[PDB]
Write a protein that holds these residues in place. Structure first.
Motif, PDB file in Angstrom:
ATOM      1  N   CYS A  10       0.846  -1.149   0.000  1.00 44.77           N
ATOM      2  CA  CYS A  10       0.000   0.000   0.000  1.00 44.77           C
ATOM      3  C   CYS A  10       0.890   1.209   0.000  1.00 44.77           C
ATOM      4  CB  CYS A  10      -0.841   0.109   1.281  1.00 44.77           C
ATOM      5  SG  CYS A  10      -1.827  -1.327   1.807  1.00 44.77           S
ATOM      6  N   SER A  12       0.007   4.366   0.541  1.00 48.98           N
ATOM      7  CA  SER A  12      -0.374   5.311   1.555  1.00 48.98           C
ATOM      8  C   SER A  12      -0.208   4.768   2.958  1.00 48.98           C
ATOM      9  CB  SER A  12      -1.819   5.729   1.382  1.00 48.98           C
ATOM     10  OG  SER A  12      -2.238   6.496   2.493  1.00 48.98           O
ATOM     11  N   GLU A  14      -1.793   5.641   5.395  1.00 52.40           N
ATOM     12  CA  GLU A  14      -3.092   5.633   6.023  1.00 52.40           C
ATOM     13  C   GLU A  14      -3.981   4.470   5.603  1.00 52.40           C
ATOM     14  OE1 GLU A  14      -2.564   7.695   8.253  1.00 52.40           O
ATOM     15  OE2 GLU A  14      -1.618   9.305   7.351  1.00 52.40           O
ATOM     16  N   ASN A  15      -3.493   3.630   4.730  1.00 56.80           N
ATOM     17  CA  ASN A  15      -4.274   2.498   4.296  1.00 56.80           C
ATOM     18  C   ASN A  15      -4.351   1.498   5.452  1.00 56.80           C
ATOM     19  OD1 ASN A  15      -5.100   0.013   3.027  1.00 56.80           O
ATOM     20  ND2 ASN A  15      -4.451   0.752   1.109  1.00 56.80           N
ATOM     21  N   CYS A  17      -5.190  -1.530   5.551  1.00 57.60           N
ATOM     22  CA  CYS A  17      -4.833  -2.877   5.142  1.00 57.60           C
ATOM     23  C   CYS A  17      -3.359  -3.211   5.348  1.00 57.60           C
ATOM     24  CB  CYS A  17      -5.198  -3.152   3.683  1.00 57.60           C
ATOM     25  SG  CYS A  17      -7.012  -2.847   3.323  1.00 57.60           S
ATOM     26  N   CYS A  18      -2.555  -2.165   5.485  1.00 59.30           N
ATOM     27  CA  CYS A  18      -1.124  -2.253   5.677  1.00 59.30           C
ATOM     28  C   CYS A  18      -0.687  -1.688   7.027  1.00 59.30           C
ATOM     29  CB  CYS A  18      -0.370  -1.521   4.561  1.00 59.30           C
ATOM     30  SG  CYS A  18      -0.387  -2.394   2.957  1.00 59.30           S
ATOM     31  N   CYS A  23       4.758  -0.546   5.107  1.00 57.30           N
ATOM     32  CA  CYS A  23       3.890  -0.496   3.953  1.00 57.30           C
ATOM     33  C   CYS A  23       3.527  -1.872   3.333  1.00 57.30           C
ATOM     34  CB  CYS A  23       4.316   0.536   2.925  1.00 57.30           C
ATOM     35  SG  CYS A  23       5.884   0.179   1.979  1.00 57.30           S
ATOM     36  N   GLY A  32      -4.823  -4.376  -0.568  1.00 55.28           N
ATOM     37  CA  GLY A  32      -5.162  -3.044  -0.135  1.00 55.28           C
ATOM     38  C   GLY A  32      -5.772  -2.124  -1.168  1.00 55.28           C
ATOM     39  N   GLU A  33      -5.976  -2.654  -2.350  1.00 57.97           N
ATOM     40  CA  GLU A  33      -6.559  -1.936  -3.451  1.00 57.97           C
ATOM     41  C   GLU A  33      -7.040  -2.949  -4.475  1.00 57.97           C
ATOM     42  OE1 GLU A  33      -3.394   0.684  -4.768  1.00 57.97           O
ATOM     43  OE2 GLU A  33      -2.609  -0.901  -5.979  1.00 57.97           O
ATOM     44  N   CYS A  40      -9.885  -5.202   2.616  1.00 58.92           N
ATOM     45  CA  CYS A  40      -8.570  -5.853   2.709  1.00 58.92           C
ATOM     46  C   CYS A  40      -8.546  -7.327   2.358  1.00 58.92           C
ATOM     47  CB  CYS A  40      -7.899  -5.648   4.084  1.00 58.92           C
ATOM     48  SG  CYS A  40      -7.938  -3.925   4.696  1.00 58.92           S
TER      49      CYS A  40
END
Length: 72
Positions: A10, A12, A14-15, A17-18, A23, A32-33, A40
């Motif tokens: 990820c 960011s 702020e994600n 998922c990470c 990261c 995460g995307e 997630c």
């Protein structure tokens, strides 16, 4: 110095998922995307993710990937 950014799952910090520190995906996060990622996790196999032509089935999630496969 190393460039750590190319190794991110990820981009960011702020994600959710990470882990911000690495990261990389947190325990239990599969993604995460992506069109086939939801909270997630990989979407269920067969979830429609791209609308196709009238005579065809729509593109569907595989259950093992975060992207929506394109038929080639």
């Amino acid at each position: 110095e190393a460039e750590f950014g190319k190794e991110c799952d990820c981009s960011s910090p702020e994600n959710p998922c990470c882990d911000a520190a690495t990261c990389k995906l947190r325990p239990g996060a599969q993604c995460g995307e992506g069109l086939c990622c939801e909270q997630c996790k990989f979407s269920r196999a067969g979830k429609i993710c791209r609308i196709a032509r009238l005579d065809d089935l729509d593109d569907r999630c595989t259950g093992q990937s975060a992207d929506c496969p394109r038929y080639h």
